[PDB]
């Protein structure tokens, strides 16, 4: 663990430079990947990278080898199956970490420390309940204690997103149950549609290790509960990353290329944005206020971007001096890094300048259409315009504006409104006085028919025309066939905008919906 002292690492590198080593002498520095390590030490050594071998079977083997045999052999004998269940849960979450953000909304720090804490919890609670008896009934096992402790503190401590907590609760409630001691318990269902992994019938640590060693080496994401296309998504992400890395490598005269690129960008980006005319009647309407803020911000950003691009073109033409801001902008445009100045609205992480221009052109065109409709209709057309949630800079503000408009128009208070989502495939469907059209919403891992969800293996499905209706809050209990889907701003699933509800069709378990990572995306 030499990574803890970078300064001592510098000193050791200098000492190693100034020594007379014997032939048999050798220095072994074991460390973890951390930027704190000196470049000098890395330059003067033979680096060996030791990643953990991927696989559920490998994870179970590592967990079982780490835990001492005598600890598992402790009475009662149910402790062995408890430890196997905990190891399987740990393997499931750690392997699921790789497939992100579908499996986990963000990569959490699930490591050996959480496993050790969970093992200590299991030991203490089983010792408390059993009192030393050689065998105890599975009913008497404190399942609620284990589920609560590994959902709230042991494993859910690092979980911040509520939907990740819901997924973790579903995992714990599916695994940690008295039914897990039955000879026919299925750890994971629908591995390939037919085969299901079954619990080993043994009651000893040796039997569990033997079963782990006999796991087929044909792992697919369906083992973890994910759809079978998660592997394909990860593979295409890795391919794109490899292309980008090799392109950065191939980066190692450019005035003309930058000039023509900037000229193409300036031609592509629309020229002007017309601000909304603030009238006495218009200011009262919440939709007009929100759209005026949107067009003001869009026009400001558009003018800034256009002026910067014009100055870049002038510099590339050899006619303008390079200011420090201009020099930084030129460097970022050359390297392809998105400039920090053009980032007043949330964007996906690691998003190139070309994609930023492509998205900005669409946003500005949508805002131009919004402004034209507002000018022509005054205020009535703003309620009956189909606006993409991705196109707006702050979609949550749009949701709030729709809520305010409904509350003001229908004289209802703003705290007594609940959002009901209805998806219509008909083109130009008639909009109620309290319904607002929405386009561009993408459903991940599911298909909607007659406003009823169904599990699908497709990468994504585009909702034709989402309709947001605000209806007065009713104390009717939520049905068992209703699922709450998050609506993330982009595919990174880092920003949560709002949570719609949907109705499950036919016979599909909402637990599968929670585990499959089904969600709605404002933009794809």
């Amino acid at each position: 663990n030499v990574h803890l002292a970078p300064g001592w690492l510098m000193q050791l590198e200098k000492k190693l430079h100034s020594l007379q080593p014997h032939a048999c002498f050798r220095l072994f520095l074991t460390m973890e990947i951390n930027p704190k390590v000196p470049v000098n030490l890395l330059r003067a050594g033979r680096i060996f990278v030791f990643e953990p071998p991927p696989g559920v079977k490998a994870n179970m083997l590592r967990t079982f080898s780490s835990i001492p045999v005598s600890r598992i052999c402790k009475s009662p004998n149910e402790r062995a199956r408890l430890y196997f269940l905990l190891a399987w849960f740990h393997a499931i979450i750690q392997e699921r970490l790789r497939y992100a953000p579908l499996g986990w909304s963000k990569k959490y720090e699930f490591g050996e420390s959480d496993l050790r804490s969970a093992c200590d919890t299991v030991d203490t609670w089983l010792d408390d309940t059993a009192k030393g008896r050689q065998n105890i009934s599975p009913d008497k096992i404190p399942w609620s204690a284990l589920k609560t402790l590994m959902a709230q503190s042991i494993y859910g401590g690092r979980v911040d997103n509520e939907f990740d907590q819901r997924l973790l609760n579903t995992f714990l409630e599916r695994l940690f149950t008295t039914r897990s001691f039955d000879s026919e318990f299925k750890l994971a269902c629908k591995v390939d549609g037919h085969k299901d992994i079954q619990m080993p019938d043994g009651i000893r640590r040796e039997e569990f290790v033997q079963w782990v060693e006999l796991l087929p080496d044909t792992q697919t994401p369906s083992w973890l509960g994910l759809p079978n296309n998660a592997e394909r998504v990860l593979l295409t992400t890795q391919g794109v990353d490899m292309i980008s890395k090799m392109l950065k490598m191939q980066m190692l005269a450019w005035m003309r290329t930058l000039h023509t690129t900037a000229s193409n960008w300036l031609h592509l980006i629309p020229q002007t944005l017309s601000h909304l005319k603030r009238t006495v009647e218009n200011i009262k309407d919440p939709l007009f206020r929100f759209f005026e803020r949107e067009v003001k911000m869009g026009a400001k950003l558009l003018q800034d971007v256009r002026q910067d691009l014009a100055d870049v073109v002038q510099v590339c033409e050899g006619k303008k001096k390079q200011t420090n801001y201009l020099r930084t902008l030129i460097n970022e445009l050359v390297k392809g890094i998105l400039p920090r100045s053009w980032s007043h609205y949330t964007v996906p992480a690691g998003m190139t300048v070309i994609q930023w221009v492509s998205d900005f052109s669409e946003r500005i065109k949508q805002l131009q259409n919004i402004s034209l409709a507002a000018a022509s209709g005054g205020a009535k057309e703003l309620k009956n315009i189909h606006v993409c949630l991705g196109g707006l800079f702050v979609p949550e503000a749009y949701i709030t504006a729709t809520r305010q408009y409904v509350a003001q128009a229908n004289s209802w208070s703003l705290e007594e409104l609940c959002l009901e989502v209805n998806v219509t495939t008909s083109q130009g469907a008639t909009l109620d006085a309290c319904s607002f059209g929405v386009t561009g919403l993408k459903l991940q891992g599911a298909t909607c028919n007659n406003n009823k969800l169904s599990l699908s293996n497709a990468i994504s499905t585009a909702l034709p025309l989402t309709q947001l209706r605000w209806v007065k809050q009713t104390n009717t209990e939520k049905k068992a066939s209703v699922v709450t889907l998050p609506v993330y701003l982009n595919f990174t699933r880092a920003d949560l905008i709002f949570t719609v509800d949907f109705e499950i069709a036919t016979k599909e378990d909402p637990r599968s919906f929670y585990e499959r990572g089904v969600a709605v995306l404002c933009t794809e």
């Binding site: 050798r26 520095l29 460390m31 973890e32 990947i33 680096i47 030791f50 490591g111 593979l235 391919g239």
Partner: protein
């Protein structure tokens, strides 16, 4: 695009021989690398993913 990696493997095999990546698959052999090709003044940095 999901098979771009598996096809780049094939392209590398076509260009630089089939067994170009084969040695990487086999488990690392510390014996030869530590006995030879490492100078006694060269620290062996055995970095691992946290």
């Amino acid at each position: 695009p999901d098979r771009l990696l598996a096809m780049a493997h094939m392209f590398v095999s076509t260009n630089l021989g089939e067994s170009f990546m084969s040695i990487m698959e086999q488990p690392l052999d510390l014996t030869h690398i530590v006995g030879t090709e490492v100078k006694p003044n060269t620290p062996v940095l055995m970095c691992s993913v946290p």
